[PDB]
């Protein structure tokens, strides 16, 4: 429950990422899948037997786990089994509130003894992500 990426146990070797994405969006909510990565032994023409998929909301992850526990996921006569993953595909917080977009960032130091602050260089439209699990 610490992360949002779920590792699929067995997938067909003939499928592509787009087909699995369409299947997941059909069974689950629309556009509820953020990242889908299928590891490949070769460079671009030999995918492995498993895949890792990242969900946007933990509720979607729980629903997918419940569906997989009941064996209700059948994609090309293959029963998809869902298991926890080791690391996230993209270090992005699950909470949409922590994601801050188009904010003003400036640096400085307590230059004066009073309640004064000095601005050296100011950046606009920066992105701020707060990762509680990674403590960064």
């Amino acid at each position: 429950t610490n992360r949002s990426t779920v590792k699929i146990s067995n997938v067909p070797q003939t499928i592509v990422a787009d087909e699995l994405l369409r299947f997941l969006e059909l069974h689950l909510g629309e556009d509820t899948v953020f990242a889908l990565e299928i590891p490949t032994t070769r460079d671009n023409w030999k995918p492995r037997d498993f895949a890792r998929v990242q969900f946007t909301t933990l509720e979607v992850k729980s629903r997918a786990q419940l569906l997989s526990s009941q064996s209700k996921l059948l994609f090309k006569t293959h029963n998809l089994r869902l298991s926890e993953a080791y690391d996230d595909i993209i270090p992005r917080p699950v909470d949409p509130r922590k994601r801050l977009d188009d904010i003003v960032l400036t640096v400085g130091f307590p230059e004066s003894d009073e309640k004064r602050f000095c601005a050296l260089e100011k950046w606009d439209g920066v992105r701020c992500w707060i990762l509680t699990e990674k403590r960064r």
């Binding site: 059948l74 994609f75 090309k76 006569t77």
Partner: protein, 53 residues
Amino acid sequence: ESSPTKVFGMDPVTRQVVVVDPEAYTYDEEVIKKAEAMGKPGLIEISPKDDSF
């Protein structure tokens, strides 16, 4: 449209499939294969009748 012959029909008033002229199935496992491909294994089950000819 997956069936080679006209064995299944579409009912517009009920928006569901119906069985019309079941004697022209020709035992071509095309509709069953399409159902398996779509993801429904137990959608349509067709079996021959041993005591009828």
